[PDB]
Amino acid sequence: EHICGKKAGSLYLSGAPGTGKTACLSRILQDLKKELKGFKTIMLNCMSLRTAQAVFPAIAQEICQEEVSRPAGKDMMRKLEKHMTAEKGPMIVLVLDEMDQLDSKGQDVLYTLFEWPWLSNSHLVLIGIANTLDLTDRILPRLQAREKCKPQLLNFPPYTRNQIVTILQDRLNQVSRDQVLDNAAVQ
DNA sequence: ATGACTGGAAACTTTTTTGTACAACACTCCAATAAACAT
Numbered sequence: 001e002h003i004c005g006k007k008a009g010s011l012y013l014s015g016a017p018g019t020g021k022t023a024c025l026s027r028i029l030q031d032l033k034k035e036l037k038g039f040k041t042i043m044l045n046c047m048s049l050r051t052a053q054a055v056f057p058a059i060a061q062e063i064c065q066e067e068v069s070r071p072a073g074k075d076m077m078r079k080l081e082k083h084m085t086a087e088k089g090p091m092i093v094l095v096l097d098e099m100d101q102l103d104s105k106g107q108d109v110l111y112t113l114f115e116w117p118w119l120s121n122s123h124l125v126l127i128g129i130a131n132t133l134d135l136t137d138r139i140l141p142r143l144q145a146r147e148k149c150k151p152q153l154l155n156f157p158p159y160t161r162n163q164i165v166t167i168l169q170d171r172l173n174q175v176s177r178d179q180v181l182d183n184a185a186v187q
Numbered sequence: 188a189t190g191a192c193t194g195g196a197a198a199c200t201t202t203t204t205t206g207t208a209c210a211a212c213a214c215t216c217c218a219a220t221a222a223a224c225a226t
Contacts, residue, residue, distance in 0.1 A: 051215095051216080051217095052216095105215095105216095
């Protein structure tokens with residue numbers, strides 16, 4: 001609905017603490033490349049960033065694929081949000097990960113990435129892959145206070161025996177010739 | 188009788204443990220910075 005209806009907003013995915021859902025989002029991203037051709041998706045891997053800063057310039061080198069530039073020192077919050085508001089460019093999709101680890105003493109770095117798809121020219125979809133540690137209490141104080149932002153929340157319940165036993169039937173019976181254990185040990 | 192006994196006798200000292208209140212503290216970060224290692 002966002003790529004066809006020309007819409008853009010935020011989407012906070014609060015996954016279960018440690019369940020291995022990183023491969024679920026990778027399946028959807030690769031299916032959109034073979035369906036539609038014209039858009040570009042920039043990845044994010046802030047595992048080597050021990051500080052709260054040096055995050056925006058790390059993804060500033062990907063402007064429009066073939067058109068790149070170079071940093072000049074102290075130039076954020078000016079050129080990154082300028083190219084996003086351009087209606088002549090394609091719909092850029094930004095992926096977010098471990099957003100809880102990017103906090104600060106006043107989480108000021110998280111006040112600019114959640115207000116871009118809500119001001120003029122909303123052409124950015126927010127996708128945050130992170131487990132459940134804390135909801136909207138101190139990270140995003142705009143909720144339960146401001147009536148401008150309307151985020152969406154989706155949770156994932158823990159898989160009981162209805163899914164763990166099911167995920168093993170299509171795992172061993174499709175690649176092995178004969179099972180090595182009985183059905184009583186699976187339960 | 189009032190003036191003499193035992194008989195009971197109300198405020199009232201003590202503590203006090205309760206919350207708060209404000210003391211540090213290791214503090215992550217920073218902000219050049221400065222020399223060094225390229226030029």
